A paper describes a structure:
Acetylcholine-binding proteins (AChBP) have been described in several gastropods and, more recently, also in an annelid. In AChBP, the pentameric quaternary structure and the overall subunit features of nAChR-LBD are fully conserved; this also includes the typical pocket-like active site at the five inter-subunit interfaces, with several strictly conserved aromatic residues for ligand binding, and a C-loop for controlled access to the active site.
We docked twelve copies of the homology-modeled BgAChBP1 pentamer into the 6-Å cryo-EM structure. In BgAChBP2, the putative disulfide bridge C16↔C64 is lacking, but residues D25, R63 and E70 are conserved. Instead of phenylalanine F71, the single cysteine C71 is present in BgAChBP2. The only possibility for this covalent dimerization exists via C71↔C71, since the other four cysteines in BgAChBP2 form the canonical disulfide bridges in loop L7 and loop L10. In silico, we assembled a BgAChBP2 homo-dodecahedron, with three C71 in the center of each vertex (not shown).
Numbering used by the authors:
A (entry chain C), B (entry chain D), C (entry chain D), D (entry chain B), E (entry chain E), F (entry chain A), ...: 1 to 205
């Protein structure tokens, strides 16, 4: 459509950079992570797995170069996620491969900021037992870079959990959704690793 | 981010080596294998298959070249598993293709040591019968290079099995997890092959 | 710790390269230089020397070879500066040998990029006179490879000077810090040499 | 298709065993034999041969090794008969080589049990005379291992003969089909040999 | 590791040949096929499908060139199946895509002989009915090149079926496993096609 | 690509055989024929011709020789139809030369079986009259070897006609598609000839 | 194997043509379609989906060039389906992605004719209701090029449906299988599209 | 001929795969089956056997790997059926071994789809009685994987039967050809098996 | 003209290779496919066929040998398509043979990459109905190797569809052009086949 926009895409995609961390100076890359819990689709007592429909908000800043003098033009362009590098964030205890609800498209900004929000259905281990009871049940899943240590990737969160999107007539009510950031160590490695633990406590309406 | 780190990745990835065993001298490659049994998710009586959530610790040393004089820099870099060669270790009797819980990221070290730990959900043949009984039930699965003989790949293990990670409120209790290394022969080939037999004995709490 | 990381270090350090410029093709090595002026510790009227606490950001790309197929592993490793070749950048007019605040550690990246940032206390010639006056005083020191001509080493700078780190309650206020790159010639040699002139203008609060 | 299934085939086929009787302990191999008489296609008065369309149910247990821990996976795999050893059972008095209606595929089970059912058209000696008469005619053919004595192979049968499959509008009606097991001796050898004598008595409708 | 081995791989892989049948003279390629029935994992009455865990032994000779004078060196090398051409052998009546238990690795020999054994879980059509009965049930599946006629590919089998590997405590007992080679014709084509019919007869213990 | 595959093609193509029926023994060649009626594209009232988009499944077995010992290799290879002999099957009453939708490629199998499926648009004589009426209209076209008598070529069919592929929103609805095999005689020759009569009865939706 | 064959493959594959319709003159490509209904594996009342095991015979003629003078050589070569262009024929109402029973191999002939027959398991919408009743139930699925209009692709069928292959002891009996070609129009496009409607009427035995 | 084509064959044949079901994930292989009834060559009253000249269209998808970047090249290659795995589909009640009219060549496509169409002459049991009468006679033969259950192989059909190819002056007229898919169970096995029942009803002209 | 160029052509054409897939190692050939929809020339309501003027971008890599040391010379040479092997890609549902707008010339590169772009006019089945309406109409045609399965040929696409070339004053407006890659199975064959489905949705301006 717009020629101005067209040059933007081409310049960044063609000339700008291959998979590599563009930032030479000592700076780790921080990725903000937010969860919007859309719905708790199902619970399996025998399996002890629960399914969550979530969208993950991920934001990071990449270094981009401005070759052509930027003029008032197309500020944000949308591109497929494949085009650019994305973070490794994954659920530590997912029973199965997560499925993707939405297309992989990411908006990029001139400053270099990128916003990618996938929609996912994830199945993770959690005992459903006592969902019916008033107390309800609690489940926790931790998300975080598999490979990256705290040094390489720093995870940050704005708030606890986004309930607002939550479906009004979901099978299960949400007593409370929390996303607490924590740093933890593994026997594999001396480096600290940061993950966000999403603890959802819910019960049947 | 850090320019110093950036050169490291590029040098190893771009210039350093294609899929090939870099070691010319007569040295087999040893891969240490460790299992952290996260949880026994499910048992299927009709199917006679059991599902395990495990993460596999795999360590090996690859030969790398240091072109640029290494200065105090980024000691370990994380890269996707696709970038580098990984071992063939697979479960001998998996009913289905294993699924991958975590992203494929591997930490590499200047010495050339590489640590890759995938998280897996594996379904393997095992009769659930008498899980309820006090004696419990025993299952065994052997892991080992499919193609590689003992000559090419040597498998080593530090300890029996890592129970500590095991989920506290798992459906099944772990009576004992063992990883014994054994060498075995097949009618196909005169070469000895080494596999680690993971024998888990568990019962319902 | 991580075996994967361990191989990385060993491969680059042991096999990869001795002090030599790994780059055969006609390419000069560019080193980006940045100054973070931490503080102006002291001024000596009689001596006419001033002391600066700075950290120097230095980035360069070295050619590294990837022998073992890189897998997702330790992306950046940290090593002592002694291990790898570092640039000669020195202050042209330092009254005394600079002292080193921080350990000599440099992060290296797979791409081969290396980031080394030393912290230094440097004493250089500059007349303190009229520090008290509103106009303040100006000092200049030039940094650049002693031996290397522009051909061999090219110096680049991202920005003027990093004030942000500057101590809030420093004895002297910073009117402006600038790092301008300049190329200059010496009677010794017909080759052009590039240095970054750090001109700081400061006064007592 | 399924990776899990794929390993199964390969393991048994590649590594598991060559033509050899895997059973070291003193155990003869018993093969159950059953006949499903599909139809009596034709009778030749001059030739005195009769043609039967039958499928032979053959079951035996072979010893298999489970290397990889069996997980819930592909329980039964189908493979060509050529892949595994089959019994020698043949009709003692076949006028001509039997033809094979169906592909040679055999289902194998983890326990090691194998079920192979070929469909055959067999021509054997039998006088057609008096087919038209009410009494009808009787024919007998014996099936049994040619080489194997009772010691090596034991033959067993569940029932007399399977009439149900028999074509409704066959040229000849089945007065009675019987499969009696008998052990017999031959002048060649002192060992007893077991065969199943299939005696069919039929007449034209 | 060994340099000698390293050259071997590179020479065959890099220089030796693309997907093409290297044999110019009039020679069909024969592929020996063997089945090791690991276990009959499951039976589905409603589905009328049975699952087999098998490993398939496949052997063939490819023409290779020896450039460098072969010295006493690494006789057999292991490589991924993707690297070299493999035969099309597939189950004629598989309900679903077979899954692969083991990694795709194949051992190659200097003579050019190649041994590839995949482990598979295969689901094929077969009526489970009367498994409980003493007679048991019979199933047949035929394996053979889909495309290749007898002219192009010839299939051979050493023995009937490998029971030895069969799991001792499998859900189903193996009455007999057979692999008979047969040549058959299809209305599509005048050429004869060869397949191995694997007929397994099994029952519940 | 694969060297192993490469030899296969070359051996069969170069050495294996010229246009000639490779089968010396007394065996006619049977060709299975199946029709997948993709769509009835058009009807011409004046012309009284109808157009069918069909793909023809043709299978036959050719005798191939295996020179090089077949190892586990490329089971089925694809080659152009020109390379190998194909059957003469043609529509008896085609108004015009049939056009070919798909490339002429045929898969061949080691057993010698060949599967060739062309896609065709054929125009044949048939009165469209009363397509609109509820009764609809019937058309018949017979396919069969022009030259070959029943002795030389035998035609076989698995089923009546494959409706499933039929386009959902085709101009004409399919009341019933049948493929009945019939043998017929011509005054030219005393030999019986076999053809498959495809009778399609269709009407406008 | 045969050198003569080898050249054939290479010439057609390497030099002969990329995905493009080789036919410049005004000729549509006709693809004959035939269905061999192997078996009706299952019916799901709740789902209202039925599963069919079919093989599709597809034939088409592609234009090939004969560079080297063809001598008596390898007439038909087998190659992978990926190598050559195949038609888009798909089931209009498939509930799920079809699975492939057989390897994708296609036989090609010198004339350019290609025969490709895949084996498929397809799940399509159809109400099972009243399968038990004597009347039975009817299901219809239409196959045809998704994209191609009648102009581009013409579908033709030889016969109604191939019952012969149908499994003798299938769960469901086949009252009649028909493949009627029909041309239909869609609101999307003014062009006529041709599909083959496969209507199968079956009941439980 | 074409070098590009040549590499294709070699890569798939040599490197790509041995008889094994390449599909690890849980996918059954579906094979479409179509029958093109070329002609009903003969009927034998005494024998009660009928001969059909048919070609069988078989299509299946195999998993292939693309090593070399595919460029516009030879899309479909033809290879002998022996080269690749073919399905076991066989006539349940064939009186004699089917003969093959055509060479076993199969076209393969890059996507992996394979089309194999054999031409066959098949003799199956069927009473000729009352062929002369107006009502005619009906015969049924079922085709389907011998070994494979519905799970492993799924059969699908596009249409009823392809009459079009049917010879115009065949000895017998085709009243209707049908191919209905049905699933059936056998006492041997609890798994469902799918077959295509080809029911042809024909009479003398 | 240039002698240097002249040797290039001769060497590749004369000495380099016949139709054969030059790639011995296990590598499938991938062919990238792109469509540039030039114009929708016509729609035929009665015929239900639509005509597209497209050019097909096809790219693949062939293995070439460099005999003479390559010096700076003619990098890309143009040759007739007949000279080298081209892929089989064809439209599944083309009503008629496609015509060729442009000469068959292909550019080849030293790396072995080949780019061939034919211009075609294709007629495919599609209902024109409701072109006038605002909603417009949708048509789909699938392109893909006829013979080649996914194993042999892998198809890849860079983008959805190239609208830019589209004629400004075409009879029909393009609402959206998409090229989605899909893998599908056919009943003929167990192998997966990949095709690109071109779905164009257009309406009259």
């Amino acid at each position: 459509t717009k020629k101005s926009r067209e040059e933007i895409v081409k310049e960044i995609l063609g000339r700008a950079n291959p998979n590599n961390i563009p930032i030479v100076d000592e700076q780790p890359v921080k990725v903000s992570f937010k969860y919007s819990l859309q719905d708790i689709y199902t619970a399996d007592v025998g399996t002890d797995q629960v399914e969550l429909g979530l969208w993950l908000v991920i934001s990071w800043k990449d270094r981009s170069l401005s070759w052509s003098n930027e003029c008032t033009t197309f500020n944000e362009l949308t591109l497929p996620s494949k085009y650019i590098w994305l973070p490794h964030i994954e659920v530590y205890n997912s029973i199965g491969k997560p499925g993707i609800h939405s297309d992989q498209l990411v908006r990029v900004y001139k400053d270099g900021t990128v916003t990618f929000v996938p929609q996912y259905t994830i199945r993770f281990s959690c005992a459903l037992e006592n969902v019916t009871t008033e107390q309800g049940a609690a489940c926790t899943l931790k998300f975080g870079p598999w490979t990256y240590d705290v040094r390489d990737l720093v995870l940050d969160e704005s708030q606890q959990v986004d309930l607002t999107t939550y479906a009004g007539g979901e099978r299960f009510q949400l007593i409370e959704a929390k996303q607490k950031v924590n740093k933890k160590t593994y026997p594999c490695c001396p480096q600290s690793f940061e993950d966000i633990e999403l603890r959802v406590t819910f019960k049947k309406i």
